Amino acid sequence: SFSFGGFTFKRTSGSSIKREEEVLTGNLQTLKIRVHEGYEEFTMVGKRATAILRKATRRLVQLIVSGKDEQSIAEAIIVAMVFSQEDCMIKAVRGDLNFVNNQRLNPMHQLLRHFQKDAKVLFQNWGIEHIDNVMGMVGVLPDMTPSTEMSMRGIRVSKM
């Protein structure tokens, strides 16, 4: 149990080792981040959203989100994309990362605030996939619009 981007995570399944790694942003900035290695399954519980995150080494496997509005769902998705530590998320940063709280934030909270400010490049470069339509699951598009046919890769919105 822990906390990240306004969400309480609880690992329900799996495990990982934490490995320090330098990554490179889409503006060619160098970040030192603690990379988690292994398949994991989390419960995410926020104030206006909840999600099930299944996850591997630098890869989002599946996110199933419920929320009280459009914004809250968009928050969970962003948090989960940052949390996954995926390189296409890291490559989607535009400009330099200079966020402050006058103290300088850590690389993960740096990427989190950047995408919370503008999610558009993140969403529009993540990738679309054809969906199956299993029970109670709808797709969400890069413009936050729902779909029964296409979705952002590994991202589902629960209608349950």
Ligand X SMILES: CN1CN([C@@H]2O[C@H](COP(=O)(O)OP(=O)(O)OP(=O)(O)O)[C@@H](O)[C@H]2O)c2nc(N)[nH]c(=O)c21
Tokens of 31: 């970040």
Part in contact with ligand X (CB under 6 A); list of ranges 24-32, 105-113, 119-127, 150-158: 105-113
> CA of 63: how far to CAs of 44, 50, 105, 127, 138, in Å?
10, 10, 26, 14, 12
Applying CB under 6 A, among 7, 83, 115, 126 the residue interacting with ligand X is: 83
Stretch of residues binding its own copies (CB under 8 A), selected from 2-10, 61-69, 97-105, 106-114: 61-69
Give the count of beta carbons closer than 10 Å to the beta carbon of residue 146. 12
DSSP character for 100?
B
- With CB under 5 to 8 Å by kind, the binding choice for 57 among ligand X, its own copies, none is its own copies
Could you give the CA distance from residue 145 to residue 134 in angstroms, rounded to a whole number? Answer: 19
* β pairing state of 30-37 and 17-24: antiparallel
**Minimum distance between the CB of residue 143 and ligand X, rounded to whole angstroms?**
12
The contact set with its own copies (CB under 8 A) reads: 13-17, 21-24, 26-28, 30, 37-39, 48-50, 54, 56-57, 61, 66-72, 74, 87, 91, 118-121, 123-125, 127-128, 130, 132-135, 141-145, 147, 150, 158-160
